[PDB]
Amino acid sequence: MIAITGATGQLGHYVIESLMKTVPASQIVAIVRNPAKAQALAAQGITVRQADYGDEAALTSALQGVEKLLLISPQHRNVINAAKAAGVKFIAYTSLLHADTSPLGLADEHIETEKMLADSGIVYTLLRNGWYSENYLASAPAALEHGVFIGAAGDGKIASATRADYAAAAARVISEAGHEGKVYELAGDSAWTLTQLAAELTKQSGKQVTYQNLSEADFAAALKSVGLPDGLADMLADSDVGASKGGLFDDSKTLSKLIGHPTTTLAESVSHLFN
Ligand SMILES: [Cu+2]
């Protein structure tokens, strides 16, 4: 039996779809706060167990009979303690690429969870996921509308991959043997700068798009005047700065080796913008 916490997101959806290619639906259990609002998961035919993530006891019950748990990102403290109480034997966690040394502020919370796992006594594997190509492409439309893509990543190299790629990796780790106790640094086979992104954008769109590098404050002070919340804006700005320092770069090709095929290139992802 495989359980998935935090499976109501886009990544979780993909992981479940991937798993279903080799694991019977009933052997997959999605733990959610409200099975009613989780119509998607239920639609997949998987086992759904309700549990409030602020309720360790509820989580423990929801994890009964679970041998392997995929924890998709405190809340994690309750989940890990519950997994310990229920007898979970293996936990795979979606962390952040090179979390212990990462310049990105997003690493903080992940490190806290990685520490919890290390102290849990439960065998675990860290799926240290790099950036989603979708993270930057979410801003491609605006960049195309104004002919400029803004950021604060400088010449930092972003070894992005798709949620689908990361999801396949998670599914592989939680379902097949030989992936326990590992620390996998997962990223795209190739890497690109925001300058190259703009160029790829211009190439396939026919429209001119230039990258404009801003400073963290200006970039953030640019997102806080378009709608996006302050916290969200601050993170995005912090991330680009982390990227400018190589925080989103990795060339181990661990991801492609793990999934058995090349990671999805930026070019392919960009193509989806003009389908
Ligand atoms: Cu495609």
Residues 6+ apart with CB under 8 A from 70: 2, 3, 4, 5, 7, 15, 91, 92, 93, 94, 170, 173, 174
Q: Resolution of the coordinates in A?
A: 1.8
Q: Does residue 11 have a known ligand-binding role?
A: yes
β-sheet bridge partners, residue 130: none
How wide is the angle at C-alpha 192 spanned by C-alphas 241 and 208, nearest 5°? Answer: 95
Residues 79, 49 share a domain: yes
Residues 59, 35 share a domain: yes
Q: Using alpha carbons, select from 235, 197, 255, 252 the residue that is nearest to residue 104.
A: 235
Question: Which domain covers residue 145, as residue numbers?
Answer: 129-162+186-250+260-275
Residues 233, 178 share a domain: no
Report the CATH number at residue 48.
3.40.50.720
Residues 169, 236 share a domain: no
Output 76-83 pairs: Cβ under 8 A, ≥24 positions apart. Answer: 76/112, 76/113, 76/116, 77/116, 78/53, 78/54, 79/5, 79/53, 80/113, 80/116, 80/117, 80/120, 80/122, 81/56, 82/56, 82/57, 83/59, 83/120, 83/122
Report the CATH number at residue 143.
3.90.25.10
Q: Does residue 212 have a known ligand-binding role?
A: no
Residues 137, 54 share a domain: no
Amino acid at 261: H
How far is the centre of ligand 1, averaged over its atoms, from the C-alpha of 268 (Å)? Answer: 6
How far is the centre of ligand 1, averaged over its atoms, from the C-alpha of 237 (Å)? Answer: 28
How far is the centre of ligand 1, averaged over its atoms, from the C-alpha of 196 (Å)? Answer: 19
How far is the centre of ligand 1, averaged over its atoms, from the C-alpha of 40 (Å)? Answer: 22
Per the structure, the count of domains in the chain is 2
